[PDB]
Amino acid sequence: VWVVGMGIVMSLIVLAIVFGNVLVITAIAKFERLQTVTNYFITSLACADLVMGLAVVPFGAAHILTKTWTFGNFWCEFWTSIDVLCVTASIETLCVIAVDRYFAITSPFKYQSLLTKNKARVIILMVWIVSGLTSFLPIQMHWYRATHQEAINCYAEETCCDFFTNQAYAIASSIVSFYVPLVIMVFVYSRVFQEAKRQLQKIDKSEGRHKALKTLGIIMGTFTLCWLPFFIVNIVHVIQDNLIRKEVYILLNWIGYVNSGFNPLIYCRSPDFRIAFQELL
């Protein structure tokens, strides 16, 4: 009396992610005024989110509902690799956008020289290749395999699908994918807030006779609340085995998936971009 219910919610999640990614991609592609050096990063992020929504979510949904993975083992390895790739690519694109905003605000005179049309494609390709090398190489080549009896029993079984890793690989993946971008974003947005406060004081210095907090708070809080608990649990269950069950792990992982859905809504809100929506519909 509960299978017919959660399926509807998961289908709505899939539809929302697909629609949110596709609308942004087509709006940027087919409209002349929208093209900008800063909009290419948004295009890369939208592509990563679309790949996530198209590939990762439905297969995991089917696996959760029917409780039996009705495909091979090569397919499950590929699915895990694609999931890791998409997650790390999304996070690194976020940190790249934050760094670009810092460069734009802190140094306005030299902003043109630092970033150009040629230098953005190279950065995007570098981000994508480092994201790909972190996931496919250690997974597709069986270098992350564990040494537990339950782990080998699960690995030998064809139908059963589950995730087991050694502690070292979990630590390395978490460090590469989450912590460093978070530190970079924190420093960037602290500096941006300081600059905004300084300008706000400077204006009221002469023009005699808030919003920055709202914007920075929403931008940081959405990402931090969506993704922070999952990586803490990721470290914890491999440092100590008894603490974390297999259901809390899945729930906290699935919490982070919805972040890709909200990202186009929070990042793309420019008035010209809404005008671009207006023409489409």
Ligand SMILES: CN[C@@H]1CCc2c(ccc(O)c2O)[C@H]1O
């Ligand atoms: C299938 N779930 C995976 C399992 C581990 C993992 C994820 C995402 C990023 C990482 O760096 C990881 O190590 C999760 O999406």
